[PDB]
Design a protein around this ligand. Structure first.
Ligand SMILES: Cc1cc2nc3c(=O)[nH]c(=O)nc-3n(C[C@H](O)[C@H](O)[C@H](O)COP(=O)(O)OP(=O)(O)OC[C@H]3O[C@@H](n4cnc5c(N)ncnc54)[C@H](O)[C@@H]3O)c2cc1C
Ligand SMILES: COc1ccc(CNc2nc3cc(C(F)(F)F)ccc3nc2C(=O)O)cc1F
Length: 454
């Protein structure tokens, strides 16, 4: 329970670009206020940045030669209310913790990323998105208030629509550069079960994948995402396994599950690598029977699924996934469909092979100037680090930029300031807010300096 300050070598989830910071770790809020006051009174040096669970791949949660404040000990859930749907929680609370605590109230975390190991602070600061972006927006859309420790040492109560709305919306997606989010109130989504009813589809090509997302069917599902093929030559290029669904109601559950509709079942002992150590391939896998088999297994209607089944389907693959990788995620505006296809073609012909590829059509954006999601074609790819990759991804940056798209700060450790600023045309507007709230650069990070956000 005691406060500690420790020189620590930090990296994001990508394990790249390490830098040494003094890491403060304390469950005492007043100690965090005092540390920020100390940096502020210092009138120099390299400032401070908050750090959550370190799930961002890049360098936004580290500060070489400065202070890093580990927020994970501030993890109190203050209250949950089923009538108002509000949760009041410290910024260090993580989404898995929150999901579990809130389920007995018939409340659902309104935006969940592909991993549950992210803090509320990290969720706000990266304005995270999920499988339901097109129906629910991003994390920032659901924050009703937050308490922000600013450079002047004061704790400001921010609301999306109040007098401090400008600062609220600069903090959403602000990558911790407006101050330290101490605490927040989130509006949860009501639910009668912890289950999904899901429809699966399998497409044969990129053209089919795009048509499926463009035919109006997306409006029938609150949740929608896809795995796609980024390695095969066209026309197989861009074929996808698509998973779409909505939260189930109690009466849609089979009789055996209806007695505990809000139950989160425990992740089981055995994963697929444990049961099939020699892999899943047989003599049929890559020919026409394999094709039919995968088509059939991935095509279904009204299937009842728990959270892991529906939302974390890679979990069953255990140690096989991510077997020195560069995570690259971008969105291209909806209208730019040919441009989007062109970029997918570029990736396939590049000689860089990504096996893990998520595809999603984002919905409307929010008013946060630095928010990543815009309506359009969102893709994540995972490239093994090898010769030529750095220069190739710089070419990808140019294409993404030229086609009106952007990269996501939570995934980036290598784009340039020039590129990033052009991708985010409201960056100057955001920088102006940051300069008002932090004239002395009390808040600073490796990303802030790299991307000239400092
Ligand atoms: C396997 C995996 C799957 C993922 N899937 C998704 C996805 O589906 N959608 C998506 O949007 N993202 C996804 N991400 C990225 C992840 O959601 C974000 O990186 C998120 O910000 C990580 O939260 P964290 O608590 O680990 O924050 P960190 O990585 O520690 O910090 C990220 C940023 O938040 C800031 N920050 C943290 N706490 C505070 C605070 N209290 N006050 C102010 N600023 C703070 C930091 O300064 C930093 O700028 C995924 C990441 C992984 C590893
Ligand atoms: C245990 O192994 C894994 C478990 C889950 C995943 C899914 N990961 C993601 N899933 C993502 C899903 C989305 C979206 F919401 F768009 F579907 C957007 C971004 C995503 N980013 C990521 C990521 O790894 O950074 C990947 C894994 F390698």
């Amino acid at each position: 329970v005691g406060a500690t300050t420790t020189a620590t070598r930090l990296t994001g989830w990508g394990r790249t670009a390490p830098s040494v910071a003094n890491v403060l770790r304390t469950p005492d809020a007043e100690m965090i206020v005092k540390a920020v006051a100390r940096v502020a009174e210092s009138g120099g040096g390299r400032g401070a940045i908050a750090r959550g669970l370190g799930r961002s791949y890049g360098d936004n949660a580290q500060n070489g030669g400065g202070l890093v404040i580990d927020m994970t000990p501030l993890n109190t859930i203050h209250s949950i209310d089923a009538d108002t749907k509000l949760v009041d929680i410290d910024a260090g609370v993580n989404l898995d913790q929150l999901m579990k605590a809130a389920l007995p109230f018939g409340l659902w975390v309104p935006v969940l990323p592909g991993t549950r190991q992210v803090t509320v602070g990290g969720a706000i600061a990266c304005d995270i998105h999920g499988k339901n972006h097109h129906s629910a927006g991003s994390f920032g859309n659901h924050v009703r208030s937050m308490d922000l420790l600013t450079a002047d040492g004061e704790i400001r109560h921010l609301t999306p629509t109040g007098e401090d709305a400008e600062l609220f919306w600069a903090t959403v997606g602000g990558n911790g550069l407006t101050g330290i989010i101490m605490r927040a109130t989130i509006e949860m989504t009501p639910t009668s079960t912890a289950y999904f009813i899901a429809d699966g589809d399998v497409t044969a090509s990129l053209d089919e994948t795009i048509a499926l997302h463009s035919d109006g069917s997306e409006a029938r599902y609150t949740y929608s995402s896809a795995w796609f093929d980024a390695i095969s030559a066209p026309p197989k290029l861009g074929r996808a396994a698509v998973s779409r669904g909505r939260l189930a109601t109690v009466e849609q559950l089979p009789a055996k599950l209806r007695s505990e509709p809000l139950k989160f079942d425990a992740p089981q002992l055995l994963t697929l690598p444990d049961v099939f150590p020699n892999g899943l391939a047989n003599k049929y896998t890559f020919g026409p029977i394999g094709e039919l088999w995968y088509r059939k297994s991935g095509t279904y209607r009204g299937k009842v699924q728990n959270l892991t089944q529906f939302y974390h389907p890679l979990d069953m693959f255990g140690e096989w996934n991510r077997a020195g990788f560069l995570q690259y995620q971008f969105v291209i505006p909806t209208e730019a469909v040919d441009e989007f296809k062109k970029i997918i073609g570029v990736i396939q012909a590049s000689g860089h092979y990504s096996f893990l590829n998520v595809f999603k059509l984002f919905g409307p954006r929010n008013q946060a100037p630095l928010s990543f999601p815009i309506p359009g074609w969102n893709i994540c790819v995972d490239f093994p680090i090898k010769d030529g990759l750095g220069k190739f991804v710089s070419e990808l940056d140019r294409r993404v930029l030229e086609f009106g798209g952007r990269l996501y700060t939570a995934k980036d450790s290598r784009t340039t300031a020039e590129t990033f600023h052009a991708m985010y045309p409201r960056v100057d507007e955001w920088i102006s807010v940051r300069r008002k709230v932090d004239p002395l650069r009390v808040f600073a990070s490796d990303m802030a300096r790299r991307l000239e956000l400092l």
